[PDB]
Amino acid sequence: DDISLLK
Amino acid sequence: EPAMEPETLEARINRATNPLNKELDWASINGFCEQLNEDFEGPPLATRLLAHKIQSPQEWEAIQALTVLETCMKSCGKRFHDEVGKFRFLNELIKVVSPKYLGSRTSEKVKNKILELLYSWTVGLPEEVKIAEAYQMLKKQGIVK
Numbered sequence: 434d435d436i437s438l439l440k
Numbered sequence: 441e442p443a444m445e446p447e448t449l450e451a452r453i454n455r456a457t458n459p460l461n462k463e464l465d466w467a468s469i470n471g472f473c474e475q476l477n478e479d480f481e482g483p484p485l486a487t488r489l490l491a492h493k494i495q496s497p498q499e500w501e502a503i504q505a506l507t508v509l510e511t512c513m514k515s516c517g518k519r520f521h522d523e524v525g526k527f528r529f530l531n532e533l534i535k536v537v538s539p540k541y542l543g544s545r546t547s548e549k550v551k552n553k554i555l556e557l558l559y560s561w562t563v564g565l566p567e568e569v570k571i572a573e574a575y576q577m578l579k580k581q582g583i584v585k
């Protein structure tokens with residue numbers, strides 16, 4: 434899995 | 441504890457990025473990239489450790505860590521390429537170059553190196569689409585010229 438992109 | 445075992449990624453990276461090194465310790469750098477591909481949990485641990493060293497207030501520590509990252513990515517292993525190609529890791533690099541986080545407290549030398557590496561991966565490893573996503577965002581926010 435992975436997380437969302439840091440904006 | 442693990443740092444007390446020379447073969448661990450912890451011990452290896454502590455040597456490869458030691459603030460006391462007078463010059464790049466290629467023996468430790470290449471050794472880290474090599475040890476990295478020995479266990480399934482190697483790549484994930486490697487990026488975890490690299491992310492922290494890269495965010496160090498001590499420039500020379502962060503610079504050597506970036507050299508380690510650049511070197512391991514240059515190796516032809518898919519697992520490591522995929523781990524760096526995750527936002528879990530890419531976000532840590534974004535925090536260093538982004539003025540919203542550590543950007544205003546990080547040297548230009550370190551920030552520029554990160555941008556150069558990101559770009560090189562967008563060109564050399566196009567299949568790691570998340571890296572391209574991160575890079576494009578940085579260029580949209582004015583971070584990347």
